[PDB]
RNA sequence: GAGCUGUAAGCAAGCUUUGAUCCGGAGAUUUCCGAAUGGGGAAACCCACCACUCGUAAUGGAGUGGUAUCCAUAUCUGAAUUCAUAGGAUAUGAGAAGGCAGACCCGGGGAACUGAAACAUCUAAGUACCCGGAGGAAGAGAAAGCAAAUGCGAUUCCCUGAGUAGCGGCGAGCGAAACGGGAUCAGCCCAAACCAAGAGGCUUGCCUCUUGGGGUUGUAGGACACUC
RNA sequence: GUGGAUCCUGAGUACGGCGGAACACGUGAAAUUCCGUCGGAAUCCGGGAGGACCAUCUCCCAAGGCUAAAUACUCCCUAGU
RNA sequence: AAGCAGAAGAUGCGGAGCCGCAGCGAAAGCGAGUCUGAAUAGGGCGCAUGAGUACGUGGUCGUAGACCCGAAACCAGGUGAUCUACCCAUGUCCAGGGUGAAGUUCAGGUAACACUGAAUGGAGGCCCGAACCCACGCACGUUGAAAAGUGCGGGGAUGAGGUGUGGGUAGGGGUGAAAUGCCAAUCGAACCUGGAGAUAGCUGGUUCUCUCCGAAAUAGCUUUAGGGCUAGCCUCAAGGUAAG
RNA sequence: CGGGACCUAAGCCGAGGCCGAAAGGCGUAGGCGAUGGACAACAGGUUGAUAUUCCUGUACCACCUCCUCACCAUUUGAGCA
RNA sequence: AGGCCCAGGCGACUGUUUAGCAAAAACACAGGUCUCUGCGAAGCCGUAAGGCGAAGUAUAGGGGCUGACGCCUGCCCGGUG
RNA sequence: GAUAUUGAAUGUUGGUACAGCUUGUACAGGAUAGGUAGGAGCCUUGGAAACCGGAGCGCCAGCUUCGGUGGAGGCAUCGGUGGGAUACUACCCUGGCUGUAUUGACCUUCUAACCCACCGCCCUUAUCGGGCGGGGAGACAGUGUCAGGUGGGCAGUUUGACU
RNA sequence: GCACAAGGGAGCUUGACUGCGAGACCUACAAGUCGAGCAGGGACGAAAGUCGGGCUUAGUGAUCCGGUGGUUCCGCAUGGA
């Protein structure tokens, strides 16, 4: 579960509430399930939406 | 983001009406439909190519007609046709007339619908022929009919 | 260079001055399992297809080789869908899976007991553990750096700085850097701009696409013109 | 080596708001760096840094890549303590 | 010091670096003075009554497990449904006797089936009772034959049934006709290895001899009362020295 | 004869594939998996240990001709499935 | 190979349970009732896929309370859902 | 709930690039005076005076305007006012409106993406998925970020001493 | 303890001041209490002389962290902040 284009990936780090609790969480990746050319053929493989802006075309 | 459109969006815009047209459906819909193109270097480079190239062919189609077309319509043109007693003309010299006397005797070539005369010329004597050689400029054409036989 | 066919007594039988046993260098062979790879599998078990060979009058049977998956190149096919693709078939591939040493290292996850005489921020600690990769070392590395002087010039590691600054329920506790002195010593290529050739698109006289020539710097450098 | 007619010097990136992590640094005035979202620059007549920030000054050209040497370890081998 | 040459060494180079000789003030800063202060005033800290530095022995302290043994417990990574709980697929077991439903046929009988009586009927989480299963009342055992039994009697025993084989549910969890029950003789949170030599203001132990001196069980504070700091009491060394 | 050169349930494995920090989980095709289904031997003796496996008789199941035989057909053409 | 009778309490009954102290008045049971759910049901397992519900479709499936059968479940919606 | 995935309209309320212009008195006064320069002149059949309706303003003084009937004269330096003179160029935003394109938001209908646990074909002996073709919704939902409310379902803890 | 007022009244005033402070009590520490006297301005009083809170003992709790006013202070190169 990663972006094609680019290196990004579900990361992690915690949660500071008030009292800086430690708690653990996740960070996800805002990528979506689109039909890219990636190859000589499209593939509808997941892709950021970052990257998606003024970028490769769909 | 920046697309070079090729029809209509709120009218007919084949001049690549370049505007901002909110690039998720931009791409979408211009893509699936060939409503329009990526406004890159290429394809910007290649529509002012293409417009520029049509504005000099049509600058240059428009000179060279006026000109000739204008300067040789000052000249004088005559022809014949039989009349009666009380100057009543047996006929009518229509445009069709005219142009046939123009490719028969000076080889002018002009439209007859270009040139037109409605009042059908009914008098054995000289007349001037306007004429639509371009919307914004016309010249006139010296028509004269004489009697025959 | 004269005892030796082990530990291991032997009982028996044999090899050795044409040179044994023995020592070292390079080789042959290496049943089955095992990443195990033809299929299955209760590890060392069972069952096959295609070729060559043995044998029977035939099956039946037996010996050698090939027959997993992923990935790269190429060739033939190439449905919905008309071309075309997905997909299928074939040949090349000292390519690759696995542990290893209970160690060193680069990164992704990631605790609690404990201490603070309780305890939640904090400490424990990015420690243990788990995961993926290689090397003999790895990481880093030639300043968009330090520094504030008639200034040093890639990183790395050692002594100092220093338990000083600073951080901190300003608690417990945490903890530097640079200068300085040392061990070593090496600096280099690409893109960009411009130019030669060709290809496709006709961006129709313009555009990018590929190999090559090019140049790499902050006293700014390169292209361009020229001197070399 | 000479000139600044003209061209280039690494973009969805430097950075910014939001929620985190590592830098001795615990969000504190918090520089610098890495992260996941959105916004988004100049490009030499330019840009970054000097522990918030601004002007002068000083140093350097990031968003491309490689580099052995001094450094850590021993499963094992040879010899010796 | 690092480092260089040197037998893993001593030695030589290496003054990079640290401490003292000047202190005061938070700091600018001043300087045997300085700070405070309006102020030659007064007072705080110092000199004038200079001695520190580097090694080695010993006492003590702080960080490392830090005096030796001792937990219950916590986290991470793994092994377990061959016992037991439930579920799934496929087989197997229930000797004998009794009861008698619905229904069906016939007879009576009503205008008509309603209704009654005879014949077959063999349903039942039916009855009594073997194998099998569960243990409920009592005795023996409790260093037993057995780390949960035996002897007598007891309940179910054709439907929520017992059982063989194979398979699944693995702990911050599963299962549970539900008791805090079972999960390999361990379960209010299974077992193995690591963190880990966890921590313990708690108990126990702490190994040769002589000699000089010689206490305490008291005050204050304390998330503290069986703990800890200061003071009180003891000892060792150097000074004032005759103050007690 | 109990099972393998026969089939299959639960369940597991599982190309491709779908997911997910990694490790990995799920699953199509396909295949494993009897505790099931189909399958050809029975009756008398033998030794100290083996026996519906050895000996003595009668038999059965799958398959091929070196031969054997009768049938059809060699293209509305036998035969196989 | 059955001791029986009189009378009351508890639980409609058969069944299940604290292996290894308590077999019961405990649990469940058929029944009643309230509530949720219009089908990619709701609920549940799982980070997500993927699955149970269910090769089901409101007379069907989940959650709570009470437990056959005869009579009834009376008042209060101020407080909390 | 905001944002990216995720836009097209019909109307709609602000602001931009074009545009349309009007608001002005302390009194003195014939009055409604804001000034700074040019100022001895201007409109008049492309028509005075008067008349009436409507639009606007307002310190209710009144003015202006536009719609038009009626038609040959109105206005102005100069006479006086007071701090400052009335005809043409402008501004100070005191004052309200309409049109075109973007610009952002509000509330409306459509479809393009996104979905498919709806189907037909092929991949393909496949109830997985994935390409094509139809339909269903559709800027929704799902997904990643940020925030608010609920949350013993779950986790780490605390709950003093003298007596 | 106060009748020589510390108790009652009448006038003027704010010493209910600023820097200090020889030396003492109490105290494990922190802390608390008295204080003649010096200097700068004052009040009362002709003067002497008194006034650094109440006739005297309880009327109040630290550190850290925050806020307000004044500063010959410092301010990560320079000048500011």
Redesign the interface.
Known sequence: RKCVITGKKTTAGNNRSHAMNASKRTWGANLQKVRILVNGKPKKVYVSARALKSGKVE | ?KVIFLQDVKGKGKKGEVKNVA?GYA??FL?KKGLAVEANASNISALNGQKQKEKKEAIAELEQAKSLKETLEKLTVELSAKSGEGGRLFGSVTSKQITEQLQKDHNIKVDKRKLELPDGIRALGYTNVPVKLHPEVQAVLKVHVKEEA
Do not use: K, Q, V
């Open positions: 983001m690039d791409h979408n893509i």
